[PDB]
Each structure stands twice: as structure tokens, then as C-alpha cells.
């Protein structure tokens, strides 16, 4: 005989019925990097801890009027 029932039962007791696979469709020829988590910085310290001030304020921009004839 084949004893297909009983060799299924053999396979059951010896492996424990965890015996199939979830086959995944995979269609792309190329596999790519999964898109994952990307934080932004939370520094324990600032880089320089003091903002530099307005470099380019107006009183510093405008140096001079010209006083020439043209």
C-alpha cells in the first residue's frame, strides 16, 4: 500500500504540522531598498548654542551716500 494517510501522520508527529509556506508574489526583476524610518536630529547640545546675529542689517549694508556732481 502507499499508506498515504499514515505517512502524512508520520510527517505530522515528526515535524509537528508546521509544514506549509506563505509564498509571496515577487514580480520585479530588481529588488530595492525598503523605505524605512529616517529621523531628524535631537542634539543634546547645540552646534554653537548662540545664534549669530543679523549679519546684514541695513545700517551695515548702506555704507555711504555718494556726494558727487553726476
Amino acid at each position: 500500500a502507499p499508506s498515504a494517510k499514515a505517512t502524512a501522520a508520520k510527517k505530522a508527529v515528526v515535524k509537528g504540522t508546521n509544514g506549509k509556506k506563505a509564498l509571496k508574489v515577487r514580480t520585479s526583476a530588481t529588488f530595492r531598498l525598503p523605505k524605512t524610518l529616517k529621523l531628524a536630529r535631537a542634539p543634546k547640545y547645540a552646534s554653537k548654542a548662540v545664534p549669530h546675529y543679523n549679519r546684514l542689517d541695513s545700517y551695515k549694508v548702506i555704507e555711504q551716500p555718494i556726494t558727487s556732481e553726476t
Partner: protein, 43 residues
């Protein structure tokens, strides 16, 4: 059509799958391969 056998997998994946294939297909000493005459489950 699903072409799962045709894809270009990544490299380390290729390594480990080929490795298992290779360790299957290789003749072995008896010292190792007393491993995998290993234990069954209910015990």
C-alpha cells in the same frame, strides 16, 4: 506572470541560500553530521 525565480536578489541573500545548497550537496565527515542526526520534538 509571477517571475519570482527570475529576480536578481541581493548579494548576502545569494550567499546564504547558496551556502545551504552547498552544505547539502557536499560530502561530509562523520564527526560533524552526527549533527542533524539530531533530536525529535516531543522529547
Amino acid at each position: 506572470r509571477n517571475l519570482s525565480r527570475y529576480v536578481k536578489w541581493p548579494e548576502y541573500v545569494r550567499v546564504q541560500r547558496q551556502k545551504k545548497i552547498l552544505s547539502i550537496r557536499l560530502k561530509v565527515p562523520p564527526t560533524i553530521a552526527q549533527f542533524q542526526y539530531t533530536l525529535d520534538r516531543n522529547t
